[PDB]
Amino acid sequence: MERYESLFAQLKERKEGAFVPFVTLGDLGIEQSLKIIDTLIEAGADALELGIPFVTPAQCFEMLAIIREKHPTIPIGLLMYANLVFNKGIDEFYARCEKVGVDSVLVADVPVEESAPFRQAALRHNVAPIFICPPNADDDLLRQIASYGRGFTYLLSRAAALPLNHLVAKLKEYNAAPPLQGFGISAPDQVKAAIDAGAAGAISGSAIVKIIEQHINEPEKMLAALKVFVQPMKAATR
Amino acid sequence: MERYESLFAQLKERKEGAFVPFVTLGDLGIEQSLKIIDTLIEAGADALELGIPFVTPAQCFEMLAIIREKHPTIPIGLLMYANLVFNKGIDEFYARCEKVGVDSVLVADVPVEESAPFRQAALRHNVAPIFICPPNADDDLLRQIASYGRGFTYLLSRAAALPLNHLVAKLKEYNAAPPLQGFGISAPDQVKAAIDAGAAGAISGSAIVKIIEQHINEPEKMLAALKVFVQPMKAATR
Amino acid sequence: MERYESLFAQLKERKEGAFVPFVTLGDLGIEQSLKIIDTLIEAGADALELGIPFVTPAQCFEMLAIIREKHPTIPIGLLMYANLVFNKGIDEFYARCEKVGVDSVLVADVPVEESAPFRQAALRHNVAPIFICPPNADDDLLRQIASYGRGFTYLLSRAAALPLNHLVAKLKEYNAAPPLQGFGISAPDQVKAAIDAGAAGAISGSAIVKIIEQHINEPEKMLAALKVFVQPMKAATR
Amino acid sequence: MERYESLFAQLKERKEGAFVPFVTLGDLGIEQSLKIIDTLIEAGADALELGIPFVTPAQCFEMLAIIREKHPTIPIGLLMYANLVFNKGIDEFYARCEKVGVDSVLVADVPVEESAPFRQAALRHNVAPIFICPPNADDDLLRQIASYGRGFTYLLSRAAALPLNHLVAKLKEYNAAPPLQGFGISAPDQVKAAIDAGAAGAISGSAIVKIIEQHINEPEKMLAALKVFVQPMKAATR
């Protein structure tokens, strides 16, 4: 299945960009985590990028399974570190992702030059291998990233760096998967600027979501609190 | 009302910088806390920055009301964490601040990028939203901070970092609210250096004030003890 | 503790207004007075407003202590005159109120402009200072009343006067404590009209309660007599 | 002698405004009245405005004589109604004021247009004739009031009205006696606002002073009670 392919096609028909929140797992229990994720989706998230920081990883996969069960169409991407993959085998890790329904995997600490085993395991298990594209990527790197990646291309957060328009223009020229500008933390105007420069959307972490995740246990209060921050981010993609 | 606006205008006419002590609430009871604050004002404080650490918060607001009642002209700024605001609603929190007479609010753990709801609630309730400016703030951040803030701009404590003169020079170039160099703990010479570099003044916490707050209950003894430390700090702003 | 805060929160969750009878003390002895108050509560009163007319005041405070002991959750507000407070000291009076469990104090003959010492003593002793809001209150007065009051705002009885909706709308705009329309004497339809106009409830005196207080000594007969008048008043708040 | 002239010169040298309480005579006996007035002076009153409501008037003049004897420098102004003056003659009334040492006289119910006989009797007896200046006084009235008055100009309580700054600015432009904003009842912040707008000070009546006048007979208790209210009013003039 190709959840990213379908999401991006649906977004274009609407001249919309994608807003993808990044949330790290491991802090609170399954129930609270599931509430936060459920609320972000109801609040307007087009896709999800979930991190398993450098709650056990096994429980995080049970959470991914529960999310997939409740939201069959939303693209779910995982961001993790190599040590986790090595723990029980590369092929085994990607088999587990395929099993639970993970759409993409970004191994954060693996340089593109040493990515072959990870990307091949991904392809063999119908999981999109995600690559990070730096601001100052030369023509070669861009051709490689466009060639190896699937799902979407992760643009590293800004802060010689090529202007967003150029980098995106080139990636599109080399048939790379849709570029999503990464942020870590961002404002609506920054998301709008990324999309105006041609990005397919944005992936951003957030201090507020983490604060709400803790401190707020009521579903209704959580939804009200998140809408205040998520709605303007999604409105910046239209 | 604009207490900061009037304080800074009066300080300029005197070629003086502002000395703003930062004191955390929550340790001792209302009476002792009120004594310490009363003494700092009699000792020479131009404004006050009060923190509600991460005595209940409700009692802290009663204290703020009592302080405002006794000192109608002195600017009172609050420094707190998002969890407190979320406890009963963002708008509700700023409404309560306006009600008691708080002049500014600095939500310490909220990045500028996710500040929209807090700053808009501040604006709607006549409370100045305060922003923290890091040493190595790029041109963008400076334009944003200058645009969103009111009352004063909080310069994060030093310890690539731009030299104080530059950072201040730029902020003034972008119409930002008066910059106050933050410290946590400082000496008279450090305050003087901040003002000589163009800062409108300094905000500093202190180990001595906390030691006096505890251990000394006599108003006369407290005043004598504080003057020894406060007078030289204020003398450094002239 | 915040009995008013909790009462109003519970009433909203039920889309109900508050019915608060006002009863003057001083006529009959402790036992009969306690019976009347006990019956009004059993009959449906959400809170109580007790007056110490312009039985000694000391006995009235013993009664307040006995009422608080028997009804730990019901808000108890006192309405009295300045001469009483001055008799043994402002701070001393509010200390005594806090001691017995009084939730609010309304000093009827003190204008808002000369209220500073009374409201500050209230704040220092965890007692809500109540202010009277006239029908034709200008924007200033409304801002001041909203700023100084706590617990609830007392709307002076009607009989240029601003229409109830407006006055309430503004008070809510300035974060004032929940407005209760005062009456002295009222009918169910009048209470309903006050709540439909946005008031949080009504405070009303009554000729019937006083007649029952005298003439009826039997607890069963008293309860039956009061229910006839109280139930419809409370039904008007739903 | 010119007690107002000297008071205002002394206040300017100190950058201070004047606080003038207004107290009506006629309620209690000479001794109690004298105690209240003595306490207001010890509490901080810069001048006194005494009213003889619309104790006989003859006794009130004996009181004025006793006050003058005990406080030789404090300006004493009288506020009364025409009927009193007519009772035994205009010239005779002002002769009596001069005799006892009254510094100024404000005949409340006499319009400026019919003031000639009163103001001329005042001038002939070295008594300052006081005039009331309304909020919406045209340029003519202002020129007349500035021309006929002495001692100070009484600004009628607010509640098209010209903003305080303007009215004061004009009066100063026409050489009028120092303007004092009248109130009837006021808070410290209102006094401060009047002075910040340029007024030479404020004259205010008070519900609290009347309550203390009755109910409190002990000099020590009276002084303590009044200081609580007078000190903040006088602090608002500095």
CSV table of C-alpha atoms in Angstrom, one decimal, chain A residues 185-190 205-209 211-212 215-216 225 228-229, chain B residues 54 82-83 86 90 109-118 138 144 148:
chain,number,residue,atom,x,y,z
A,185,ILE,CA,9.7,23.8,16.2
A,186,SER,CA,7.8,26.2,13.9
A,187,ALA,CA,5.3,29.0,13.5
A,188,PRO,CA,2.5,29.1,10.9
A,189,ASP,CA,4.3,31.8,8.9
A,190,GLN,CA,7.4,29.5,8.6
A,205,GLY,CA,8.1,19.0,16.5
A,206,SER,CA,6.7,21.1,19.3
A,207,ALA,CA,7.2,22.1,22.9
A,208,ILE,CA,3.5,22.8,23.4
A,209,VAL,CA,2.3,19.3,22.4
A,211,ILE,CA,3.4,20.2,27.6
A,212,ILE,CA,-0.2,19.3,26.9
A,215,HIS,CA,-0.6,18.1,32.5
A,216,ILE,CA,-3.8,17.5,30.5
A,225,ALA,CA,-5.9,23.1,23.7
A,228,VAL,CA,-5.5,26.4,19.2
A,229,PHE,CA,-2.1,25.5,18.0
B,54,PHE,CA,7.5,25.0,38.2
B,82,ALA,CA,2.9,26.9,30.7
B,83,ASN,CA,1.5,24.1,32.8
B,86,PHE,CA,-3.1,25.4,31.0
B,90,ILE,CA,-4.9,30.6,28.7
B,109,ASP,CA,9.0,27.3,28.6
B,110,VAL,CA,7.1,28.5,25.5
B,111,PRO,CA,9.2,29.0,22.4
B,112,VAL,CA,8.6,32.1,20.4
B,113,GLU,CA,7.3,29.9,17.5
B,114,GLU,CA,4.4,28.5,19.6
B,115,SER,CA,3.6,31.7,21.4
B,116,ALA,CA,0.7,33.0,19.3
B,117,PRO,CA,-2.2,32.0,21.7
B,118,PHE,CA,-0.3,33.3,24.8
B,138,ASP,CA,19.7,35.7,14.1
B,144,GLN,CA,10.0,38.6,15.4
B,148,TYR,CA,5.6,40.4,19.3
